[PDB]
């Protein structure tokens, strides 16, 4: 029947976005951790 | 006999093959279809030897309906529908030859399936 990963464009940028991760005190921990590891795509 | 498919598919395949080999006098196919088609063709040429109505209206069910054969013009476009050929050209060409008018020639297998092919002729 119906499987999970039904993809959209708005939702994937209003959940895992950037501004939605520069709008907290925890999102910044996430970002800085992704920058320490030396990652390319900090956040989708 | 030799089945190849369901019933009606075989019937259509034979009603196909013996309608060529009426128009070209020659055909290159496999070995089994060859044997069944020599039987059928020879059985559908004796009807070319009566030439009346009943033989016409009995032959007119084992031949692809309309398949032109036009190499003729005087000042016109004469069309021969591959049955009219059966009753105009092949018929009067076999009056003295009795049964058995086809030759089968075993040539060579094929590239992709090794199905030993064969020819069919008329004289």
């Amino acid at each position: 029947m119906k499987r999970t990963y039904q993809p959209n464009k708005r939702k994937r940028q209003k959940v895992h976005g950037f501004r939605k991760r520069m709008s907290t005190k925890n999102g910044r921990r996430v970002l800085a951790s992704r920058r320490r590891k030396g990652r390319k795509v900090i956040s989708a | 006999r030799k089945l190849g498919r369901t019933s009606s598919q075989r019937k259509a395949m034979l009603r196909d093959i013996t309608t060529d080999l009426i128009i070209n006098e020659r055909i290159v196919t496999t070995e089994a279809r060859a044997k069944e088609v020599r039987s059928t063709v020879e059985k559908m040429i004796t009807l070319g030897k009566r030439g009346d109505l009943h033989a016409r209206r009995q032959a007119a069910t084992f031949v692809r309906n309309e398949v032109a054969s036009v190499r003729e013009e005087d000042e016109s476009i004469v069309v021969e529908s591959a049955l009219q050929k059966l009753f105009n050209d092949l018929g009067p060409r076999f009056a003295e030859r009795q049964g058995g008018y086809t030759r089968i020639l075993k040539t060579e297998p094929r590239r992709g399936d090794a199905a030993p092919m064969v020819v069919i002729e008329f004289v």
Partner: protein, 56 residues
């Protein structure tokens, strides 16, 4: 079920002995002396029974 052992090196052959490929029925054609298959049209000569067939 499912094998209870690997087959030795010997048994492999001793079973494959009957896995061959034989060619049979090779004749000398009559117009070019080349090998042809009996009861079959000559491919290079084109002839059969001393007569030409493949022509148009």
């Amino acid at each position: 079920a499912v094998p209870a052992r690997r087959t030795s090196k010997a048994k492999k052959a001793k079973r494959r002995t009957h896995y061959k490929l034989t060619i049979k029925g090779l004749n000398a054609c009559s117009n070019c002396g080349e090998m042809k298959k009996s009861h079959h049209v000559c491919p290079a000569c084109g002839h059969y029974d001393g007569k030409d067939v493949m022509s148009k």
